[PDB]
Amino acid sequence: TFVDIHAIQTLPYSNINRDDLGSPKTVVYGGKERTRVSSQSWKRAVRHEVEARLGNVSVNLFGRMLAELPSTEVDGAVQFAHAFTVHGTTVEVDFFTAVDDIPKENDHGSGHMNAGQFSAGTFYRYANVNLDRLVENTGDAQTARTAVAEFLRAFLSTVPSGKQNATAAMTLPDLVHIAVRFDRPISFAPAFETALYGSDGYTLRACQELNNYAERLREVWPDDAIRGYATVENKTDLAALGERYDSYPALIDAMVAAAF
Template sequence: MFLDIHALHTLPYSNVNRDGLGSPKSCIYGGVQRIRVSSQSWKRAARLQVESQIGSPTLRTRQIAATVAKQLVEQENWGTDDARRAGRAIVQAYGLTPEDADDITKVLLWLPYTVLDELATLAIEHRDLIRTLSLPELDEKGKSKRLSKDEKDKRDEAARAAVALLKEPVTRILNERNATIALLGRMLADTPDHTVDGATEVAHAFTVHEAAPDFDYFTAVDDLAPNSGAGHLATAEFATGTFYRYSTINVTQFDEQLADHETARQVIAAWVRTFLTVVPSGKKNSTAANTAPDLVYIAVRNSPLSLAAGFEKPISTSGFGYLDRAVDVLNDYTTRLHRFLGDDGLWSGYAGTIDTKLPALGDPHESLDKLVQHSCDAVFGTLPVEASS
């Protein structure tokens, strides 16, 4: 069973998600340029808030070895060398190779914060073993000694053999997941059992109309300069637009992963509301683009269904804005799509700032909170009881 989330969300002059050159991200759709906000950007903004709300933070890092070492030094009064040996041993036991100079790994690990305490406890339990381990050799300049690939491979293999006793507990700890990891999923090719198949899919948001970045020329005044000239000149890019946003949650999968009906419901409710109301933080101090969606449509279905194709033809305007027309297009396309498929889902409802009746979108709700509550009632009132056992 899937919970489909659709929204029409207008952003004012802003740049909430930049590309490598600092421009608003964009795409070509329907033969014209649209402004785009990546799924990763909106997911991260929502995830951080949800984790704060449910009290279950995570960290995504390449510095797990250094982080564990720092905790051992600061909280357990370990010496820096032994603490570093411990951090490197944990990474090596997991099958990864820390860099000689700074102990970072080539891949990002995404973990619940609680694993840091577990890893530190594990290191304390195996301190005698850890003390026997070697650290990377340094040359006369204090830098890591250069080794051939063959020498490095042999050294790394010997290191992994030395920490073989730690492999099972380290793997168990680093493969732990919390609710947001189960919800969004994680992938690590080097360690497949670290991978979690996420229950949520999030589409890139795009404007329902043609849109292009606008250049803003700005200056900064040097208050101590003897004249009134600018101390800094530059340009920045911004854009405006009404975006179609879509996400879907495989509620059955998520419920089974958590094995806790009530927690699954709470997390999904928190995620849906936060995902809809949060805005990515790019250029937030200079644009304050803190808007909410004007229309939210939620549907419970046996299979997910995006409505993005309804906006393949860009909406045009004659000075009356895009939102009202986008609302009509969404309702009309949903009507035609449901008729074509012969499937209008198991339940649906909508809420927003608009007064228009939208029969294709199900029951109207006076607030977002009530819409989210009723959508969760629809889902968890029909999930089989055994899904949470």
Template sequence: MTIDAATRYLSLHSLTTFAHVLLVRDDAGEPKTSTYGDAERVILSPQSQRRADRIHLRDEANLGTGPLAAHAWGVRTREWAVRVAEALRDEHGWEAQAALEMARTSLRGVGLNFGSTPNTAFLTKVMVFAPEKTGSTLAQIIQEHRPELEAWATAVADAATAAAEAKSKGKKKGKGKAAATADEAMDGEADSPEAEGEASAREEKVAPMPARIKSRLICGLAPADAIDIALYGRFLAEVASAGNVDGAIQTTTALSVEPASIVRDFFSAADDFKIARQRVGTDFTDALARLNAAAPFDAAAPEASDGYALDDRGAGMTGHQNFFNGTFYAHSVLDRVQLRRNLINGGMSPEDAERAAQDAELALVTAFVNAVPSAKKNTTAAPGTLPKLVLAHVGPRPYNYAAVFEKAIHRHEGVPSLIAAERLLEHHAMITRKQHVDPGTVLSYDIATTKYLDGLRDAGNLGPTEVDHPAELSPYCPAGQPA
């Protein structure tokens, strides 16, 4: 399929109703909110949505069920030095500590900075998004240039030692004369600017990493054919020449179409031993036998506690957590031209890039429909939620419909999700008429919304084509032929 100016952008819109969830939190653990239009709204950050989509894409690929199963992926982590060291050890027989030190020194040589505490000494200060095979790729380059890199690493270490000694001597200037004299005698030389200058000169004489090796290592960090880097992009300020990628996906902050509805939920947790004692009304120190008994009196009563009394009153612990309810408008855009450009720049042929781009688009629309941030999933089951309405359409530019909900929908007006669907589709009908764009496709997982769509269709007012499967939202999957 040819991507021309009129079909460059695929705009995706959804309305999803969540009940009693906490999909994203601020630094205080509270739901994120923002005042928009005439009311305060609950919001879902773009980062949480994008991560949910990316994890869904990869999980589907790992299961071999998605269109991207055969494609390479990226990994975003601070642990690349550890991964390179593992490859040096396992694939090239290096001693573990020597591998760690060489991996860190080599990555420093290309411009990456590391933490300064014992726990972060081998972690880069920023996360680096690179192809999943980067650890092995960089290890192979280091192995091929081992003698030269070891000599360079030794020079770097010597320079660092000299600089540390010079700095230590500089601190002695503030001491008294007697103490300074004693220190000088202990060091065997006078504390002088000449000594500091000599140390600095030694440090400055250390050559940077050999250019040809540095160039190869930077190429090893390049995005290559990682499909998620082509989709979401990356920015690596510390190593600009490593190949920054403009993402092909735009994501807006999802917002509730109604005023913020936050519930302060009080909870109590039971202590199993305390409950076991409460069942028989006796203060026992060892209630395990009664806890495991089929009936409260099936087990013999243990001896009473000796020297202290156990309190059987109340719950084991109590607390509170805020949750929210509401229907959220979410919006993402795929720049179909940028995606192909990223894939070609990563080394794909135009033919391979076209196939990969089509696979990525089919997978993306499926993730947009199905992916939900997983925070508090065990106590909310939020990932099981499906959207009530999804709208997809192509055009010469992105179309963000968030302004449709500048006026919040209040409950006395009716069901917020249904009113939101009416507003969204009416606005889209106006845009398609005035901008002369294709009306696209629409998908619903809600009975009331489906009946509303049926009414529009019967009246001849339903512009988008209704589909039954997420992949059909993409122009690459004709209606009636689910991927």
């Protein structure tokens, strides 16, 4: 039993992750470069958030504590894909200068000239949860049950803290789709192997494209997978993703109910 969750969360002008230089991380995928938010960075924020709300399930859902010595279970079972933009994104330079407050018999000899890179886009996120091994390792199906539910809510609610004070990139995902699969976990990343063209936005178009990919994969391999999705849009139906839900926590509740 594998609970996986896809989110199409967009981010305004921000620089959540960056290289050894200042520029943000990018995959070159589908022939078009696209900014990405690395898996470990995103995972760290989710794990910190889960451990904060939950008050050793963190060594079980997440493989091991970074600052603790290995306790024979380094595997976390949870798999975090690296978030990448639905479309191709050019790196946007922002030239800035820190101002010197004390003025000489000179004007504007600015304190510090520099230029930092930022970018914005609609990242297609994705994660997986190996439920069976989580139950076999945690023991109690209930702690696992609470932990799984809280992990999904953390996956949804959080946004990394990086250059966040200079860019308030705090945002909620536009689409979440949780599919309790028994065969195997599958990511809808190839839905975006062809980066979408621009000028009309990408949220809606990425939503139905992911709906087309779910119809096709569901067609080739018909499965007993329990599905459901919640969106911030009521304008378009996506029947292939399963029954629609009024909200995210209601959805998470129905899928946690579906796993057990």
